[PDB]
Design a binder for this molecule. Structure first.
Ligand SMILES: Nc1ncnc2c1ncn2[C@@H]1O[C@H](COP(=O)(O)OP(=O)(O)OP(=O)(O)O)[C@@H](O)[C@H]1O
Ligand SMILES: [Mg+2]
Lengths: 446, 53, 101
């Protein structure tokens, strides 16, 4: 910062001094090497020598390493960090050398003295000089005890991005997401969502992202899967499905599609899914698997499905198949997979009920059960659930077992439709005549 | 004091639960209302009578 | 165009049949123009002696907030707006101001 006029270079004075202190320490004069150095630096500090202060500062740190003076290392680390503000970058170099010490030295006291370096920086005498050094340093504590309930707190306390801004973007995404995996271990799902939203602020950092982000963002395919999310998880697999364009492994790409099409169907009907299913369908890469026609069973012919036929024609998605990799996870489990079996039946029953609504005015209750493949009492239970949620219009007269899907026609709606019929009829007449002139009055003259 | 207000809340909730069961259909046997509501036929009949007025 | 003629926009009008014929940039009062292109002195920080701590304090509200705004968004404070340089009649006040000028 401040450029002092060049009068005397202080490097030479320490050059012949630091190695001399090494000899005294080697013999066993651990103290004599220590106290002498501090007086050496203090003179440099008044002169505020960046290079001179840094080189000497590490030496005392370096010397204590080989000296095996762990008790004297910690006490020496503190005394060198709060004497006269030191030189801001001077402490920066010191932590770096001390940083490599923890990563290499095993045995318990590393953690005991590990926290000592954490507090030396803490959040005072910090920033670009000793900012990022802290981030890794707390990460080591994270792996200190392999990850537990307590560790999740030990890492959440670090507010990434907002505070550790002046540090590498690629490494940032790793730290921000690594604590997310800690959240899942403890099974804290509310916190996982909020922490998750802080990384999606920026995307498209896949320049060298073989697994850095895209394949490491699998957690959201685990967090979101917990409660009820199907469409949300579906969009995620497609998101990694762009990786096959980047990672086009034969087996990997095949399993992803089976997953994408698997519980795209699982999600309930909604305008968001209607255009999503269309995009998934029609790709020139879906024909490689029989699953394509299963998904096609939700688009064409209106597919009045028979759950008996669906199971018998597609029992492979529960045991085995071409690769069946998603099938074992999606449906092959004991509890998590089994739930998705009931949910699929609900969607298959939901498709039958909705489609029959379009093409039916009144359907007897008994025949409704046969199409839906559930008992009459169960059919009423499902119908009531849909009607109460304002999804399907249906009024059931259970005294006669007849349920009609027709809204009581309003006087204006009955007449309004008649108005629209005339408009089309008038327009067609205009179009019909205008097509006659193109033909009758063109070729005739010739 | 909370125990003082339970009686009102039970009356209020019973109102909502009856609508949730009668909305899904039209003319329906009262017996099935009792089975779904889990209540006797006598009180359900009267409760409906007060509701309609 | 009838989309840049928002309320407040300066517009020139014809002398005889008043009709907008051009949208204009906001005017600069000639006093304001003379208030900017003023200093020929070119005084350096090495001339204002004695005031060393004062300069560092003044530069903390003129230069720092206008070069590294992300620093103050960390702590959460909003950098100060004003600055009053008072003192005895004859110390360095106008000299210091011209220095930053
Ligand atoms: N530290 C200094 N180094 C050099 N010159 C100085 C210093 N302090 C004061 N001066 C002298 O002060 C003279 C006038 O200073 P200046 O007009 O800024 O002061 P002032 O009387 O307090 O200002 P004002 O009346 O405009 O508020 C300059 O010509 C300069 O030579
Ligand atoms: Mg003055």
């Amino acid at each position: 910062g401040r450029i002092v006029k060049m009068e005397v270079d202080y490097s030479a004075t320490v050059d012949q001094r630091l190695p001399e202190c090494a000899k005294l320490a080697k013999e066993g004069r651990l103290q004599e090497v220590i106290e002498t150095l501090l007086s050496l630096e203090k003179q440099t500090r008044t002169a505020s020598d960046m290079v001179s202060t840094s080189r000497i500062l590490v030496a005392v740190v370096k010397m204590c390493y080989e000296a095996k003076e762990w008790d004297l290392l910690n006490e020496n680390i503190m005394l060198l960090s709060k004497r006269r503000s030191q030189l801001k970058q001077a402490v920066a170099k010191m932590v770096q050398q001390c940083c490599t010490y923890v990563e290499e030295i095993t045995d318990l006291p590393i953690k005991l003295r590990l926290i000592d370096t954490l507090r030396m920086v803490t959040e005072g005498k910090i920033y670009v000089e000793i900012e990022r050094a802290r981030l890794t340093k707390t990460l080591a504590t994270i792996k200190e005890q392999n990850g537990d309930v307590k560790e999740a707190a030990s890492i959440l306390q670090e507010l990434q991005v907002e505070t550790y801004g002046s540090m590498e973007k690629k490494e940032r995404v790793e730290f921000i997401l690594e604590q997310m995996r800690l959240c899942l271990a403890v099974k804290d799902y509310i916190r996982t969502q909020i922490i998750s939203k802080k990384i999606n602020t920026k995307f498209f950092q896949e320049e060298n992202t073989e697994k850095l982000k895209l394949k490491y963002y699998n957690l959201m395919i685990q967090l979101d899967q917990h409660e009820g999310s199907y469409l949300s998880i579906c969009k995620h697999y497609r998101a990694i499905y762009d990786t096959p364009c980047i990672q086009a492994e034969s087996e990997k790409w095949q399993q992803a599609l089976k997953s994408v099409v698997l519980y795209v169907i699982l999600a309930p009907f909604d305008n968001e899914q209607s255009d999503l299913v269309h995009r998934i369908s029609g790709d020139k890469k879906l024909e490689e698997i029989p699953k394509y026609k299963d998904l096609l069973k939700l688009f064409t012919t209106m597919e009045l499905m028979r759950w008996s036929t669906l199971v018998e024609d597609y029992g492979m998605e529960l045991r085995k198949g071409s690769l069946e990799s998603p099938a074992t996870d999606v449906f092959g489990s004991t509890e998590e997979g089994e739930k998705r079996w009931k949910d699929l039946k609900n969607r298959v029953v939901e498709h039958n009920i909705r489609i029959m609504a379009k093409y039916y005015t009144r359907i007897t209750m008994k025949r409704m059960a046969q199409l839906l493949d559930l008992s009459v009492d169960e059919s009423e239970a499902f119908l009531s659930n849909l009607v109460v949620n304002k999804t399907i219009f249906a009024k059931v007269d259970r005294l006669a077992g007849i349920i009609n899907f027709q809204r009581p026609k309003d006087p204006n709606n009955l007449l309004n439709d008649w108005s629209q019929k005339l408009n089309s009829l008038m327009s067609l007449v205009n179009k019909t005549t205008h097509l006659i002139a193109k033909e009758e009055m063109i070729h005739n003259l010739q | 004091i909370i125990s003082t207000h339970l009686a009102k809340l039970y009356d209020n909730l019973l109102e909502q639960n009856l609508i949730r069961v009668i909305e899904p259909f039209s003319r329906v046997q009262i017996e099935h209302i009792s089975s779904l509501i889990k209540l006797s036929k006598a009180d359900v009949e009267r409760k409906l009578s007060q509701m309609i007025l | 165009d009838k989309s840049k003629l928002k309320p407040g926009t300066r517009v020139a009008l014809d002398m005889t049949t008043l009709t907008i014929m051009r949208y204009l940039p906001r005017e600069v009062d000639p006093l304001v123009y003379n208030m900017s292109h003023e200093d020929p002195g070119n005084v350096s920080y090495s001339e204002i002696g004695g005031l060393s701590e004062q300069i560092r304090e003044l530069r903390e509200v003129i230069e720092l907030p206008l070069t590294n705004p992300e620093l103050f968004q960390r702590v959460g404070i909003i950098p100060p707006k004003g600055c009053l340089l008072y003192g005895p009649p004859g110390t360095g006040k106008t000299l210091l101001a011209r220095a930053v000028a």
